[PDB]
């Protein structure tokens, strides 16, 4: 592979946007985990709610679903797509996201391969 590990999530998130396979927010993520239609989850390390982190971690662990950590919620939301593009091209309007669930993968081999390799290396 050529793409970096941390920068390879953008392709998957964009393709899940295009194919409508994203559960955004804690309520939708928890509902998807209970429905166990989830494939993987994305968690934001920077947050002010320890109960949020505990609930997401326990739901991911007890449903044998892999979890990914992200630096901050604003970058996570910018990846997710809850932003508007200015004339120059920067996202002045960003709404942070603390948890994301990928319900359907995008039909991209390169994007999935690196994430699967990282998950296998973690295990």
């Amino acid at each position: 592979g050529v793409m970096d590990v941390n920068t390879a999530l953008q392709e998957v998130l964009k393709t899940a946007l295009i194919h409508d396979g994203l559960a955004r927010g804690i309520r939708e993520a928890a509902k998807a985990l209970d429905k166990r239609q989830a494939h993987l989850c994305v968690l934001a390390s920077n947050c002010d709610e320890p109960m949020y982190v505990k609930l997401v971690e326990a739901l991911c662990a007890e449903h044998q679903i892999n979890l990914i950590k992200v630096d901050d919620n604003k970058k996570l939301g910018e990846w997710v797509g809850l932003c508007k593009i200015d004339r120059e091209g920067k996202p002045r309007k960003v709404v942070g996201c603390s948890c994301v669930v990928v319900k359907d993968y995008g039909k991209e081999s390169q994007a999935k391969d690196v994430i699967e390799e990282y998950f296998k290396c973690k295990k």
Binding site: I26, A30, K31, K35, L55, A58
Partner: protein, 72 residues
């Protein structure tokens, strides 16, 4: 003819304002120190409302808000 106003009725009928609840997901689950998760709210027996659609713990009944199913 010209329209008469006649503006006098019950002073103001107010519109229902929905309650703002912060982090309503958390109260559905209880957590032990070992890391276990227990679902406080019952799960509806309907087809669509089977896993993540919890019911309502009213003082004398159980109510699913997604399909109006009610139990004692």
């Amino acid at each position: 003819k010209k329209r008469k106003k006649k503006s006098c009725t019950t002073p103001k009928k107010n519109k229902h304002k929905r309650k703002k609840v912060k982090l309503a997901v958390l109260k559905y689950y209880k957590v032990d120190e070992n890391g276990k998760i227990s679902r406080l709210r019952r799960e509806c027996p309907s087809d669509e409302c089977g896993a993540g659609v919890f019911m309502a713990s009213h003082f004398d009944r159980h109510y699913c808000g997604k399909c109006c199913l009610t139990y004692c």
